[PDB]
Amino acid sequence: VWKDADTTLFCASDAKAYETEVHNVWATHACVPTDPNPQEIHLENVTENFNMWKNNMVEQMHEDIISLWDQSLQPCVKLTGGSVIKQACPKISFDPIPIHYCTPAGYVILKCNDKNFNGTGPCKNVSSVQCTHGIKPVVSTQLLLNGSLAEEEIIIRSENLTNNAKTIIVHLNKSVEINCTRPSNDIRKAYCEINGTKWNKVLKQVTEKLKEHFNNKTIIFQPPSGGDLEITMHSFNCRGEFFYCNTTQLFNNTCKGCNGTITLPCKIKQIINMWQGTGQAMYAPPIDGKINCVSNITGILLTRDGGANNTSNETFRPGGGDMRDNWRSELYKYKVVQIE
Ligand SMILES: N=C(N)NCCN1CCN(C(=O)N2C[C@H](CO)C[C@H](C(=O)Nc3ccc(Cl)c(F)c3)C2)CC1
Ligand SMILES: *[C@@H]1O[C@H](CO)[C@@H](O)[C@H](O)[C@H]1NC(C)=O
Ligand SMILES: *[C@@H]1O[C@H](CO)[C@@H](O)[C@H](O)[C@H]1NC(C)=O
Ligand SMILES: *[C@@H]1O[C@H](CO)[C@@H](O)[C@H](O)[C@H]1NC(C)=O
Ligand SMILES: *[C@@H]1O[C@H](CO)[C@@H](O)[C@H](O)[C@H]1NC(C)=O
Ligand SMILES: *[C@@H]1O[C@H](CO)[C@@H](O)[C@H](O)[C@H]1NC(C)=O
Ligand SMILES: *[C@@H]1O[C@H](CO)[C@@H](O)[C@H](O)[C@H]1NC(C)=O
Ligand SMILES: *[C@@H]1O[C@H](CO)[C@@H](O)[C@H](O)[C@H]1NC(C)=O
Ligand SMILES: *[C@@H]1O[C@H](CO)[C@@H](O)[C@H](O)[C@H]1NC(C)=O
Ligand SMILES: *[C@@H]1O[C@H](CO)[C@@H](O)[C@H](O)[C@H]1NC(C)=O
């Protein structure tokens, strides 16, 4: 027997000894070793209600990544309003690793094994576990990177699809590779390569699905309508450098004669609007050599235009900024219960 409850979680990872990569270093002192023998217990004929938009695990993971980034990605200058601090900012080794979130004695994690689970409402195939799976804490905007994939169809996730102020998480069932490079020897100019055939096939399927939720209306994609570079661009961190990539070529409804390699223009930025809290961090110029990251696009962050009930269209724009939706997109099938 159990009841919905919150408690302090603990983390587990496969961190290595002597490795200087910051995620490894942080997991070495902040987490325990991964469960050598994990085994979930199935709860026969048990239906449970989940709410990925109201999940204290998300808040706790957010706390951890903030602590991780604050211990590892030390900006040269942090203009956090008023006075400014110019601490140490050596170049570091940055590559996220999987982190497990685990419950203490007296608690368990309920796991939604419904393959069409959209993140809210009842779950028919419930299992109990001691730790979540390994979740990579990938910080990004617009595109969710290096995550898990929907096991069946593309899933639409939203706290309330009818309210246009609620972010939509698109969970893909097929990943799309995005290959980003800053060639060696403008040191800040880069480019991301995406296969256009693939991207346009998935993007078409996303419109088909969104049609299902918006009574077969005309689905239109448009670039963000204003804001800072972090959300009008696809932002992410590659080898400790902050990439800002123009996704206009991705969120055009054009696709013809357009089906080759899509080349997104990118910049490595030194001055960043932080995602942890309102403030500005400045880092040193980028490192030498070929900077390259090959990542899987496993989801999209979408915001729907308002003032369209009286039209025949629904316009969708890439979103982002609140990193909790990134953790949400992986924590959606977990919930913490107390053993009564
Ligand atoms: N948890 C709650 N409830 N609020 C937190 C909000 N608090 C306050 C201030 N916050 C902003 O103001 N933000 C707006 C800002 C643009 O002005 C950009 C920020 C960004 O996402 N930065 C970013 C940097 C690097 C990478 Cl790689 C990346 F993927 C993203 C988001 C966030 C946290
Ligand atoms: C229910 O979940 C279990 C894992 O706990 C899985 O093996 C099984 O295929 C699931 N059943 C359905 C119908 O999805
Ligand atoms: C998710 O599924 C539940 C089923 O109970 C439904 O009530 C809810 O509207 C769905 N949400 C979305 C965004 O499809
Ligand atoms: C990228 O996707 C492929 C297939 O979708 C998968 O096998 C691979 O593990 C993924 N890579 C990462 C780093 O998640
Ligand atoms: C992904 O989901 C779409 C529907 O959203 C479906 O048409 C397609 O066949 C699915 N792909 C795979 C590989 O399951
Ligand atoms: C969803 O948002 C719409 C639009 O504001 C609102 O009218 C409706 O009450 C919301 N639904 C719920 C269940 O809160
Ligand atoms: C990524 O792009 C670079 C430059 O275009 C290329 O040299 C490299 O082979 C690519 N790698 C993959 C896995 O696509
Ligand atoms: C792009 O994707 C399509 C379909 O997924 C594939 O057939 C094609 O070979 C890819 N293009 C390149 C240059 O790899
Ligand atoms: C992205 O590129 C398009 C076309 O070159 C341009 O109109 C747009 O201003 C760019 N995005 C930003 C945020 O500057
Ligand atoms: C995604 O995973 C690949 C393989 O592990 C890695 O090379 C890449 O840097 C990751 N991307 C991000 C944005 O962390």
Side-chain angles (χ1 to χ4, degrees):
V1 193
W2 72 81
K3 42 163 211 185
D4 275 349
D6 296 345
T7 193
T8 303
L9 296 170
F10 74 90
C11 59
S13 65
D14 269 46
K16 298 303 235 236
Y18 313 128
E19 162 84 90
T20 58
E21 195 281 320
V22 295
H23 298 82
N24 274 271
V25 163
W26 180 88
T28 280
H29 72 49
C31 302
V32 306
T34 298
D35 196 336
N37 192 220
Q39 174 60 75
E40 82 192 59
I41 305 166
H42 181 252
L43 318 168
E44 298 259 90
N45 279 305
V46 172
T47 283
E48 265 281 321
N49 295 326
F50 294 76
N51 192 346
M52 72 179 275
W53 306 98
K54 300 290 219 155
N55 185 342
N56 190 234
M57 292 158 86
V58 172
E59 311 307 321
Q60 281 185 65
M61 194 173 180
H62 203 58
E63 252 176 83
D64 279 356
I65 313 312
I66 289 177
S67 175
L68 195 160
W69 274 50
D70 285 27
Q71 281 166 60
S72 318
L73 253 167
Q74 288 210 358
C76 311
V77 200
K78 206 159 75 113
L79 319 111
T80 202
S83 87
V84 271
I85 64 172
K86 3 188 7 151
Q87 35 178 9
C89 57
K91 287 311 187 181
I92 65 102
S93 175
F94 180 106
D95 189 11
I97 71 187
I99 310 280
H100 305 249
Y101 285 96
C102 308
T103 44
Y107 296 80
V108 286
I109 299 171
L110 289 195
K111 189 195 180 173
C112 188
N113 305 119
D114 287 286
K115 273 193 226 313
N116 45 1
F117 184 43
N118 70 16
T120 115
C123 180
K124 197 217 308 221
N125 187 3
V126 183
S127 93
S128 96
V129 301
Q130 303 268 45
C131 297
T132 76
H133 68 267
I135 300 169
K136 284 208 189 146
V138 187
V139 162
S140 62
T141 65
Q142 308 202 351
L143 313 161
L144 293 180
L145 306 177
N146 277 1
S148 64
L149 301 153
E151 280 116 29
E152 271 181 84
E153 309 200 15
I154 298 207
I155 308 309
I156 299 312
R157 311 193 187 279
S158 169
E159 192 175 20
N160 176 7
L161 264 191
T162 283
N163 176 352
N164 65 288
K166 288 305 157 122
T167 311
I168 293 165
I169 293 170
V170 172
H171 201 174
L172 299 182
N173 57 6
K174 221 41 161 73
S175 80
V176 170
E177 216 166 37
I178 182 189
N179 170 10
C180 301
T181 308
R182 193 300 291 273
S184 36
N185 298 100
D186 214 305
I187 43 152
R188 304 192 166 70
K189 187 78 225 302
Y191 63 92
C192 293
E193 283 205 328
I194 298 132
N195 178 338
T197 308
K198 257 153 200 303
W199 171 252
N200 285 311
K201 303 325 322 191
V202 170
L203 194 65
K204 268 166 199 243
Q205 279 169 3
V206 175
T207 67
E208 152 188 11
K209 197 45 98 147
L210 285 172
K211 255 174 183 274
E212 295 178 15
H213 298 254
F214 291 93
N215 66 262
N216 217 283
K217 283 182 78 163
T218 304
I219 302 310
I220 290 142
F221 286 100
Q222 276 314 280
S225 310
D228 291 320
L229 291 161
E230 283 76 17
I231 51 77
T232 70
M233 314 262 208
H234 165 49
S235 293
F236 54 103
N237 188 296
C238 173
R239 313 304 174 220
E241 305 287 320
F242 292 91
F243 279 60
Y244 289 60
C245 291
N246 186 322
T247 54
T248 291
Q249 290 181 78
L250 286 194
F251 296 100
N252 262 353
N253 294 270
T254 27
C255 333
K256 282 148 92 264
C258 55
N259 87 304
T261 284
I262 308 180
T263 301
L264 303 175
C266 304
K267 299 179 192 115
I268 306 205
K269 265 203 91 83
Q270 278 183 214
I271 298 164
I272 299 316
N273 295 304
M274 311 187 264
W275 64 267
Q276 301 89 313
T278 278
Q280 279 198 332
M282 186 178 87
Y283 298 88
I287 58 179
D288 60 18
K290 196 195 270 144
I291 303 163
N292 172 253
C293 283
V294 177
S295 317
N296 280 335
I297 292 165
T298 62
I300 310 166
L301 296 173
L302 282 186
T303 293
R304 186 168 63 95
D305 273 351
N309 306 99
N310 287 326
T311 83
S312 41
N313 325 282
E314 300 291 358
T315 300
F316 296 77
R317 287 167 210 273
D322 171 23
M323 275 330 140
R324 296 171 304 175
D325 299 316
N326 298 40
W327 331 135
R328 229 184 276 302
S329 79
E330 301 299 317
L331 286 182
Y332 71 95
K333 61 161 150 223
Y334 299 112
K335 108 156 140 161
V336 166
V337 294
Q338 195 173 346
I339 292 265
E340 268 275 70

